[PDB]
Amino acid sequence: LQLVQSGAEVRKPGSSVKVSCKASEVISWVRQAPGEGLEWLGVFIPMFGIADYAQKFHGRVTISATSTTYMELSSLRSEDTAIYYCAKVLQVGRNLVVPLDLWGQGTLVTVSSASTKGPSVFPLAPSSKSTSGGTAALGCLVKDYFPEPVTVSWNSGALTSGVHTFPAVLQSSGLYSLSSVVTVPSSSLGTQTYICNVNHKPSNTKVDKKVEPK
Amino acid sequence: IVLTQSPGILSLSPGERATLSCRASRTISRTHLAWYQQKPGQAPRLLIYGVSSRAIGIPDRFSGSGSGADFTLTISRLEPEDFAVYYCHQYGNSPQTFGQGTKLEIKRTVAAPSVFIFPPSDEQLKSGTASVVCLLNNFYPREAKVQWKVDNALQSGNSQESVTEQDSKDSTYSLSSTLTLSKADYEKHKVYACEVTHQGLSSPVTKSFNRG
């Protein structure tokens, strides 16, 4: 079938994280920082029973192995905040040709001194300064939450076109902030109700914010 | 074994052919290179394994060639589902390195942004801070510049930007910039302006407001 990984993790600087990857060939562990490329942590083949690492992580990574492989990263720093994937590259045979890649869903690991906190949902209210011709813009500022991620919809999903939910930024306080905007006809600002639905599952915070002009 | 991919950002139209180069600083053993594709919010999909050999489900449009220190991934005819980031990856007798990736964006007509500005909400002001948001909506190309001005004083280092992925319909980009002030600093001034520079703009566009 597939590869299943353990859930997301929040760790403080200097501690350790153990990420699991259960199977339904070598097992490779790679990671990706937000908005960054792919970085190979290591690999473990059960034939020998010995894993190979990267010289960058050689001191503090341990890969080992019920059909489950574990990757433990020690002395965690902020640079290690990333999504971690396990992967198996298996060879298939059909039509006498030999290829297939299997990935886990990924495990978000956030290294930070910050404590988990739900966001504040402020309105980005429409005005004469946020209308071009007949189209106005309005949104929601989802500020000061931790950790990633947060989901935003509009009108319980009924409003999808013209929607732009931007990637969050990491503020200097260690808390994330995001904005979700939408453009609607300006003639509707008084007649149509617009609500952003914000869900921050890590803190189990749910907010429905009605955005009105003035 | 550092891997350098080229070009950085490839801007083509659906129906043209795409050529992506991966140049290494060594030998890459022999038949130990792979090409993966990645779409925003998904895990990488192995496109080509072992330089030449294809992967299951990968159409015939994708082709891997080259050897030694120069390799190439070719897409015969680009379809809308082919625009993403592409990585090359060597896994032979090395600490297994990756390339930095190349972005395949849909080329389209230069489109200027729609610039809006949002003052802080009274709730946030009651909370103690103040955020002023500037929105550049549906522009192309991705490169754009914003500058904050509080009472004609240029703001430096107290704002943060974010850009959307390329829109699947009109192939544009959007950007939001947040300027963060204290409530006291916000109430000390009046004119808050967002100045925008983009290729599609004949003039830099200023969206401003006054407190009140």
Is residue A165 within 8 Å of A152, Cβ to Cβ?
A: yes
**Can you give the C-alpha Rg of chain A in angstroms?**
22
Do B91 and B70 lie in a common domain?
A: yes
Closest CA to B136 of B144, B125, B124: B144
Contact: A139, B133; criterion CB under 8 Å: yes
| Nearest CA among B136, B139, B134, B127 for reference residue B149 | B134
Hey, is the C-beta of A164 within 8 angstroms of any chain B C-beta? Answer: yes
Between chains, do B98 and A181 touch, taking CB under 8 Å as contact? no
Together in a domain, B131 and B174: yes
In angstroms, what CA-CA distances link B77 with B7, B17, B66, B103, B153?
A: 18, 5, 20, 17, 50
Query: What does the buried/exposed string (b/e) look like for B36-58 if buried means 16 or more CB atoms within 10 Å of the residue's CB?
Result: bbbeeeebbbbbbbbbeebbeeb
Identity of residue B50: G
Chain A residues whose CB is inside 8 A of the B87 CB are: 37-38
Residues B138, B205, single domain; the answer is yes
Q: How many CB atoms lie within 10 A of CB B199?
A: 12
* Domain end among B85, B106, B127: B106
Question: Of B106, B123, B141, which residue constitutes the final position of a domain?
Answer: B106
Between CA A103 and CA A21 the distance in angstroms is: 10
CATH code, domain carrying B96: 2.60.40.10
Q: Same domain, yes or no, for B141 and B60?
A: no
Domain count, chain B: 2
Domains of chain A: 3-111 (2.60.40.10), 120-211 (2.60.40.10)
Q: Do B94 and B53 sit in the same domain of this protein?
A: yes
Nearest chain B residue to A168, by CA:
B162
Same domain, B8 and B100: yes
Do B95 and A40 make contact, defined as CB atoms within 8 angstroms?
A: yes
Residue at token pair 């490839």? B10
Written in H, E and C, the secondary structure of A148-177 is: CCCEEEEHHHCCCCCEEECCCEECCCCCEE
Asked whether the beta carbons of residue A164 and residue B133 sit closer than 8 angstroms, the reply is no
d(CA A153, CA A194): 11
Closest CA to A21 of A101, A90, A107: A107
Using a CB–CB cutoff of 8 Å, tell me whether B21 touches chain A: no
What are B164's two structure tokens?
């959307």
The span from the CA of A176 to the CA of A69, in Å, is 32
Q: Cβ atoms within 10 A of the Cβ of A128, count?
A: 9
Q: Same domain for B99 and B120?
A: no
Residue B204: HSE in the Cβ half-sphere, 13 Å Cα cutoff: 12
User: Do residues B140 and B101 share a domain?
Assistant: no
Q: Determine contact, residues A213/A189, Cβ cutoff 8 Å.
A: yes
The structure tokens listed for A1 are: 């079938």
For A125, the 3-state DSSP assignment is coil
Structural element, H or E, at residue B56: none
Reported residue count of chain B is: 212
**Helix count and strand count (H, E) for chain A:** 0, 19
For residue A149, say if its preceding peptide bond is cis, omega within 30 degrees of 0.
Answer: yes
> Do B102 and B125 belong to one domain?
no
Pair (B97, B53) in one structural domain: yes
Q: Are A117 and A165 in contact (CB under 8 A)?
A: no
Q: Measured between alpha carbons, how far is residue B118 from residues A178, B199, B204 in Å? A: 14, 24, 19
- Which residues are CB-contacts of B102 (< 8 A; sequence separation ≥ 6)? B5, B6, B7, B8, B9, B10, B20, B85, B86
Q: B43 CB near a chain A CB, below 8 Å?
A: yes
Return all residues near A191 (Cβ < 8 A) that are at least 6 apart: none
- Whose structure tokens read 């200023």? B206
The span from the CA of B171 to the CA of B139, in Å, is 9
**Are the beta carbons of A168 and B154 closer than 8 angstroms?**
no
Resolution to one decimal, Å: 2.6
Place of tokens 């902020």: A78
- Together in a domain, B121 and B200: yes
Interatomic CA distance for residues B15 and B6, integer angstroms: 20
List residues bridging with B48 in a β-sheet.
B35, B54
Question: Measured in Å, how far apart are chain B's first and last C-alpha atoms?
Answer: 60
**SS3 category, B48:** strand
Q: Are residues B181 and B130 in the same domain?
A: yes
Method by which the model was determined: X-ray
Would you tell me which residues 116-135 of chain A have a C-beta closer than 8 angstroms to some C-beta of chain B? 120, 122-125, 127, 129-132, 135
Beta bridge partners of A83: A32, A108
Asked if A117 contacts A177 with a C-beta cutoff of 8 angstroms, the reply is no
Q: How far is B171 from chain A (nearest CA, A)?
A: 13
Residue type, B85: V
Q: What is the dihedral of CA B75, B79, B80, B86, to 10 degrees?
A: -10
Domain final residue, candidates B106, B134, B149: B106
Tell me which residue range forms the domain holding B155: 114-210
Interface of A with B in 185-214 (CB under 8 A): none
Residue among A37, A101, A177 whose CB faces B87 most closely: A37
Degrees to nearest 5, angle at CA B28 with B92 and B20: 115
C-alpha distance from residue A11 to each of A4, A17, B151, B181 (Å): 21, 7, 42, 30
B47 to chain A: closest CA residue: A99
Are residues A182 and B183 in contact, defined by beta-carbon separation less than 8 angstroms?
Answer: no
